[PDB]
Amino acid sequence: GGWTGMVDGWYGYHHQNEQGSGYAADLKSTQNAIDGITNKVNSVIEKMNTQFTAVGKEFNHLEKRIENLNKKVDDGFLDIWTYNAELLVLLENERTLDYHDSNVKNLYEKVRSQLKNNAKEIGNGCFEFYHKCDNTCMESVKNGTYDYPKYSEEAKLNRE
């Protein structure tokens, strides 16, 4: 589940260590996610460019066949737009939710890649360090700069 206490972006990290605890949004991921979503929503709206029209038409009592043709035209257009719009919404909502799931999955893998054998994969997005990992260490991991070799000795000594 998500963090109702994390309101500075869509995705982010929470930590607990010897020196303290808290959370922060991962704004590289969140901003990319935002640009993705923003472009998507705008394309849905911005591409549907209409012109000035006048829909209503008037016919007399001896023109029933023409009025009915006009109705036929309105009905076909109405069914097409209503149906396509429902499918577009349903399809995009599933894709949107998968996109979001992708972005957070990517962050997990980036962290795992840096930590390698110096942390346990436990669950709830958590990596349990096998060595002391203080605030400097955790910021280094979040920023993509974890210097794995300097922590590998401690990680194995705490397991041997």
């Binding site: 001896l62 023109e63 029933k64 066949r65 009915n68």
Partner: protein
Amino acid sequence: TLCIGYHANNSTDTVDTVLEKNVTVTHSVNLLEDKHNGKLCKLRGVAPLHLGKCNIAGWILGNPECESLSTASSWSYIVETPSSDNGTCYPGDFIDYEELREQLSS
């Protein structure tokens, strides 16, 4: 050993996709109807008005050969055969015939 797998069967049903063609799948449905029952039915609970060998002009004017047709009190649609030749018998212009046909359709 523990193995994760999936269902397979004797289905020969294939579908096409955007990347590949003739893919056999285990379960499949149509979105397309290609069957009908071969009958003209009551539409929404009301019987059609069948005119036999007469067309609407024949029926409404009273062509002598349309005398055998029954009078419907109501109808959902009108049915004429491709051979509905008995119409106007005294030649002339039936004015606004198409509008009359539309008004009497239901």
